[PDB]
């Protein structure tokens, strides 16, 4: 639940804890390296502006994977991450979670 996101030199989107942020393809989000303006929508959509592009060139490149499972079914692991109590269970991408 730590949304202190950051972008490293390679363009990979992580948080302040160093964890890779997943995307819509279930893979870590890698943004174009030379950005000029990054906007996060109210649903996880990441829109970037290539450096030097006109203002009418904002394009969505990824969507942050947001999950709303049953809270009673989650346990905190040894590294502060909440995981399913039952192993080998995937994380469905819920479309109701909003980001402020």
């Amino acid at each position: 639940r730590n949304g202190n996101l950051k972008v490293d030199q390679n363009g990979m989107l992580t948080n302040a804890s160093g964890h890779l942020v997943l995307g819509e393809n279930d893979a870590p989000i890698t943004l174009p390296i030379p950005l000029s303006k990054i906007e996060i929508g109210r649903d996880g959509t990441i829109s970037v502006l290539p450096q030097g592009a006109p203002a009418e060139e904002f394009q969505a490149v990824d969507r942050i994977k947001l999950v709303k499972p049953n809270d009673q079914s989650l346990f905190k692991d040894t590294n502060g991450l909440f995981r399913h109590k039952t192993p080998n269970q995937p994380y469905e991408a819920d479309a109701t979670v909003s980001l402020q």
């Binding site: 303006k37 906007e39 829109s47 203002a55 969505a60």
Partner: protein
């Protein structure tokens, strides 16, 4: 400390430059051949917190973004080079350009200075010089000691009348210089301008052809300042200046309250 403090600081500095420009126009309300100036305001950069047109969620974009301004400043002082009124004088050595053009004088460093002031006179050698510092007028017009009257033609030809000789003798020819952008000249004081990069190439020729103005003898060009306009502008400049001080004072009390409370 507070953004409103820095934003209103620019507004205070901008108005102070505006007032000084207004005061200079009123100071030169009797200067012959003075062109009034107007301060040009422009806003500073806007901080792009939220990009207008940025994609909000999906199938939706921000109709207007959170773009905070940084204040304003005076970016230019535009000289209004409109023709002034004519004053009739009995002197024969004060001239006026009837239209576009500038008289050319020789600065002490060697360069040619351009003036709209026509108050000229002679020096000990008879050369036509300015009535102030005494710079010679280009080209040199030497009035002979045998002259009984001076006539400066409309086409800039200077002639003198000599007793014992009909058909007054011509002693020289004056040439005036025009500029595409006379507002780009650099005012160096003493009613003199210097050519600059944006002033344009100095075009010289006879005063009355190729769009050049005509030389009017025994006439002076009064300043074009509007004394009523400067007084109204002083009212606007004073009030906007004070209302920016209100914002700074309010921020000062706001931070005083936070220090006492938090």
């Amino acid at each position: 400390m507070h953004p409103a403090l820095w934003v209103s600081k620019t507004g205070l500095d901008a108005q102070q430059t505006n007032i000084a420009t207004i005061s200079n126009n009123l100071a030169n309300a009797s200067t012959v051949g003075y062109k009034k100036s107007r301060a040009v305001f422009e806003d500073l950069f806007y901080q792009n917190i939220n990009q207008p047109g940025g994609q909000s969620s999906q199938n939706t974009e921000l109709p207007s973004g959170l773009m905070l301004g940084a204040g304003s400043k005076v970016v230019a002082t535009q000289k209004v080079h409109t023709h002034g009124n004519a004053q009739t004088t009995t002197n024969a050595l004060d001239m006026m350009v009837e239209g576009d053009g500038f008289f050319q004088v020789t600065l002490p460093d060697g360069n040619i200075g351009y003036t709209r002031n026509g108050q000229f006179t002679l020096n000990g050698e008879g050369t036509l010089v300015t009535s102030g510092s005494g710079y010679p007028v280009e080209p040199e017009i030497v009035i002979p000691e045998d002259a009984i009257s001076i006539t400066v033609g409309t086409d800039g030809e200077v002639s003198v009348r000599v007793r014992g000789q009909q058909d007054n003798q011509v002693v020289g020819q004056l040439t005036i210089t025009d500029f595409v952008n006379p507002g780009g000249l650099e005012p160096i004081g003493q009613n003199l301008y210097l050519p600059t990069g944006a002033s344009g190439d100095p075009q010289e020729g006879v005063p009355g052809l190729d769009g050049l103005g005509e030389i009017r003898q025994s006439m002076l060009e009064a300043s074009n300042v509007n004394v009523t306009e400067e007084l109204v502008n002083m009212i606007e400049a004073q009030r906007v200046y004070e209302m920016n001080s209100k914002v700074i004072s309010s921020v000062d009390k706001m931070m005083s309250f936070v220090n006492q409370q938090l």
